[PDB]
């Protein structure tokens, strides 16, 4: 709705320092640096082309609006997360102890800290078992 | 300042340890230097060229000992930047491992000779040449291939050895006196070996037509079985390298899967609608309109990691696709089971409604 | 007491028969002893070393005959503990088989020589060396591989033999008089064989440029076809061993399947709710709160056997996964057929309700 | 219900000689020996980890309660038994003569005696054919 | 009476043409006779054994010419029992084919020699030896394998030829005068060929250390590329024979499929409930309670042909199972499409009912 | 008129560039001419045949230089008909590429010699012989195969080199003085190389029994590892050619897919019921009852392109069928998801109706 | 029904010359010879085991009753005939000209004569196309 | 209906210059030449056998009537176009930018001109995205 558009206007002003209505790779890099993490120019280009519909080397506002507005259900992100969890579940039993998950997210890629893993497990251990099946997990993010 | 120092020390550790790019070129160039040293030593063995060969070999030995010493010192220095081993205690504890001991014995022997020595120099060159591997990958691969094909190699050896013995004995009987070559059974065994392997020196060869006939009829089969193991080992090497590639591919799948799960959890916890979950918000604030910007960054991270992982889910094999699609097919089984239950409840409601 | 005796006798039977672990090491050590005996005999054939070679070979022959005698006696003794053969009658009936006869003839010949003998000793050594197999696995494998590739091997032999004959005859014509080596066509055939096989003794080689040209143009093709069979047999050996591994895997699947079915039936009959079925209860009582404990044990057995069998259902091959998933897909066909019938009855009720 | 909990209390007291509320591998081994069969310490560890949710080298009471209480339908034991029977059915026809089954269970693994096989066949030969299809069998245990 | 005569003549045609069982043994025995003739001729070439070799070879030639004549006569006689060729005209027309002409020329040459002849006898033996094939299967297989791998063989030949030329020229330059072996570039080419092929006669070999170094560095690569084609052709032979087996399997599937369709139609038309269809009834009556017996026989035929065809639908390959199950999966697509249409009509009735 | 001229010039460009049919035969015949020139030069090197060899080689060189000159001129002329290069400027710019420079240097050297020259002639022949490739396909294939199997080849080289060094040194020690062949370690290295590669010249061979024993025990393993790379490269060549065939098949699939999409769009826009879309109608009128005829032609085009594409969708591989059927299975997933949603809405209506 | 049982009695008497209630391989062979065709003793054993439930080397009456009584639908003979026709349809188009079928049945296995093929095609060319699809065919025998 | 039959009569007269009721390969070739394109005699035979039901080397009128009358839905042309588009969609994402399509049809096979591609994209970009998914496309021709 209109308030969402206004929030998107404010956000775009925050990234779009030049105010040209396009998010340049330099603008994205500087805003990310303000956030703190240090990505690579090739990964910034990956950013763009993932979010860059018009292929202008930047981000027109409609792309940003659609990307913020899109929900995980709309993203069609079920099979991929399913396959990831299946990959991490060696036994193929459909379940995995929360301790192993805590270990993995704190050691792979964008390493996840203690509070985040506590939160995900709390939202996952609906049955209080620890051997969180990933079907309930995927339907949890989708729902 | 110290950050650059530690970064460069870790880079040196990586270069001396598992290399990826141009460190391969540095290893190849030190390999070239050692090879030049070996050929110079070989030439110094020759009498005619001993003068210039030795003249060049002295300076080449100086250069090679200097290079090996500096390499070992750099390796021990960089051993103190890895997680397991740090500082002085870590480097010294790492040196307790056997391979570093082999290298240091080689270095001290080189110093002692450089500070009947020909045999010691040859042995030291052999030791360092087997040393350049630094990981034992080739020997592990060869052992694994031999073990995998143990039955084929053993049967090939059995048949080939039996053929060698039998053909050699028959030729010996056929040429006991008519040929000076086969006076003793040991001579016959040597002949049979150098034929079946197809080396064929020509020092010994049957001259009686009975011996020639036996040699022909047995050498066909013998050379076939003696050549077997080469092809067997070639196929084994190919299969083993394919398996190693598959394992590396699966690890490269493992990592982005964790990346995607992390990013997905972060994005899910990043929704502004719900405020009970703050872990991701606190983490991003600690790393640091603003909140919508954070959500934009996190949803972008989810999208890019989804792209990366989906690309990482490439087939690479029939078995891989069968496995993934079979997971999908079990999902199909579950869904059709649910549909069966639903149609059963429909048919139950039927009479209830009717 | 007697239980330990029978257990050890059965273990001895297993060791002398199909070995699994360190019995391989005992077989390898007796193999080492026999090999040492063969090399000592070879050296005793030589004149210069005949003295010490014979001095060591006498004691080695004593040791080897003792070892073979005790091994055969232990084998015959352990033949009387297996199910087929027991006691004295079973062992004697087992000895009626041919392989035991070969072994006993070898032993008695060794005793007779040890109690022109060189040729007999050589033949006895050859016989025992072919004997160490004790199962004929290598010969079975080789025969199966040859039969499987009979067409490829036969065509390779045909082409190679034709090339040998043709090249040899052409070289003979080209060097009838200009070369002493090729006086007769038999000499030319010997040359062609020792070239095409790539043995190349060097005793015979064309010297006229016409002969050299013909030899080159024909030896390329000839050596290619003469090398063919080595690779063919290597591939055949690999494939045959893979097939044997697949069969062993399927047997290892067969056994835990029966284990699971047995445990599942026992657990199903172990429910305390129903009392009509007592077979499992009677069996467990015969082997022997208490009943719930029995049910706990049996449900645990079901769980563990389910784990074992599910692990045993590993792919090992594309064909395996395709077969299992295709059974699942036929199940899908049945389920969708049922759903079609149900929706048909729904559409039939439609007008009936409406 | 409560009576089931009381029966589980009695059973746990029967195995848990120490009375510590945990079924140690030694306690399981001795109770099994009282039963009569002779398993292996590695197979006892397999026992534990199959039933050991908390991974303490023993069995907390909730694990035992869930394991006794679980029914074959809850066990999700349909595809596995299906595959086992399919393995034993060489023809792939879906059927197998009861004589072959009697032969197999009396010869493989935990060999089954005459009374047990008579009972299973009686419960299986609902149509009185002898060529017991395994679909009716699996739905029989599940039902 | 005449039925047995025609049956035996057709059996003779089958034996002389494509054999299945012990006709292979007859072909192998005639092969043994021809091989004995070739070896006897080879020995007759030798001077020392010319006497007894010729004495045996005369009678062996008599026997072989008799056998070949009777075989050709039987072949021509049996050519007049097949469908294409019958009686005298059919046999004569069949003889117009080239292979029969080759055989008859061989026979008449044998008669003329048996009624500088050594060269003619050798050529006739070569011709008949290439003749024993009688089908050209080996040459077809070899040509197909070469054509399939034309690119690999051509690149291997190119690289090997270039390596031969280059190494030979470099060695020639390095040993122009210091070695008598390499006086001319042709000598160097001969050396390079007999090394790279690994024949290594030893008549020519570099003796200058520069020449030895060049020969080593080039012979490694040269022998590798010269050995390539053997393995390439082995793999090609294996793959081609596998493809031929697959085609034969598909034909063996084709035939029982027609059997099953025929039996199914017959059984369907054999139902006693309907009488409009009499074709099967008329056919069975022509071949000849009674009608129910006919239906029993026909339903049995349907059952047995169903068993035969279902067995004939064995995998033999991953591709086969994928194809069959994919037909099943397309059937699944059709069924789910029907279910979608049905649920659409249900949702259409919904508002209509409501 | 000019249309035929341009068509023939383009055909000439195609013939000199990538050939398909009988242009292969023209290339093979020029290859035959160059090969005849090389053999004539080789013979001219020989002294005895120098007269006639040179007499023929002069005219052969004239013919070959004429042929190469006309071929290069035709190539440069046809370079001016392709899209990239036209007329004079295009041909000259194309000549700026390196391969044309190599060819022109070869031509000018041939003219200069034809207008110590033996070495220059040999080098020019070598250069043109490497030139006949004109595309570098063989070298690309070999490099790709080596890179793919870099690990296997490197480990084989490491093991073989170590075995060579060790066996050679041990034999040298065992035959330092008792054999004149192994006076220096370089001699031993030469021997070890010519044995392990199985060349076996016979100039050097151990004569002391210790040396013979060491040579045997090491040459078994050495020849195995020295033969490895041949089989490895053969398998690599086969796999690489299979991959290239797969890529070509996928391109041949790509083209008819576009054909079908074009024809389908044209047919859809060709319906006479709707008149808003005229693009296809305008195109067909520009190319030119009448309209129905156009629709008939276009629907025929759709049908024939559908046949062509469906044929083009042949398996060629298991992976291909798995991919296509897996797309179908994902479609199945979508359809069953829709059915689940529909049955959910049915169960929602249930209570609403009831 | 009862009349069907009586017809089966008459048929069994016709084959069972010995009157022992079992159809011996010799009885089957002689009745077939009366019919006219000449099968092989191994193929006769195939006959038996296909119809021999009790495995007595003969045919007890219940087996014969079930075999006559069974209908093609009960036989579960859909996938097999489907696969056969698919095998004979090289194009995979799902259709085949009746001329090719006529050629095949008159040349393969138990060769089919003109009247039989005319009848099957008449019952198959419901649409009068000649390119008889085999789906309508299989559902025709099943129906 | 009748008017459709009359239009088919007129069309057949237009191709069937001989007026024999059969479309000979020569008649098809000359009418195509009048249209403008230049096909090959083998491709003309392909034409015939694709449309030639009676296999007479020509086209009887019923074949022409059925071929004109058949609609794309009746043609069963869904999986094939699906597979073609999937082939052209390298990413497997299910979508493709209209620019790539424009490039392909103007460069492959029967090259498509500007107006045709503009029309197809207009009828395809129902959502106005440019990344036309091919599912909406296939259901568009089918619908
Ligand atoms: C029909 C066979 C056996 C193949 C294929 C046809 C050709 C031209 C030769 C055979 C062959 C060689 O016999 C040897 C090499 C190595 C290169 C030698 C340099 C002249 C390659 C090479 O393909
Ligand atoms: C391009 C070819 C043909 C391969 C790959 C590149 C290399 C360095 C050599 C070839 C090759 C040999 O020619 C011989 C061996 C055996 C070891 C010999 C010891 C020096 C291995 C080995 O890879």
Author numbering:
A (entry chain E), D (entry chain C), G (entry chain F), H (entry chain H): 6 to 148
B (entry chain D), C (entry chain B), E (entry chain A), F (entry chain G): 70 to 184, 195 to 367, 535 to 600
Text taken from the publication that reported this structure:
The C-terminal domain (CTD), which contains three helices, namely HA, HB, and HC, interacts with the calcium-modulated protein calmodulin (CaM).
To probe the role of CBDB, we introduced an alanine substitution on the residue Phe104 in S1, which directly interacts with CBDB. Interestingly, two different KCNQ2-CaMF104A maps were reconstructed from one dataset, which were designated KCNQ2-CaMF104A-CBD-PIP2(-)-I and KCNQ2-CaMF104A-CBD-PIP2-II at 2.7 Å and 3.5 Å resolutions, respectively. In both maps, CBDA molecules maintain strong densities but those for CBDB are barely observed. Interestingly, KCNQ2-CaMF104A-CBD-PIP2(-)-I remains in a closed state with no PIP2 bound while KCNQ2-CaMF104A-CBD-PIP2-II is in an open state with the PIP2 bound. The number ratio of particles used for the final reconstruction of KCNQ2-CaMF104A-CBD-PIP2(-)-I and KCNQ2-CaMF104A-CBD-PIP2-II is ~4: 1. The differential distribution of the KCNQ2-CaMF104A-CBD-PIP2 particles with only CBDA bound in closed and open states indicates that with the presence of PIP2, (i) CBDA alone is able to stabilize some KCNQ2 channels in the open conformation, which accounts for ~20% of total channels, and (ii) CBDB further enhances this stabilization and dramatically increases the ratio of the open-conformation channels.
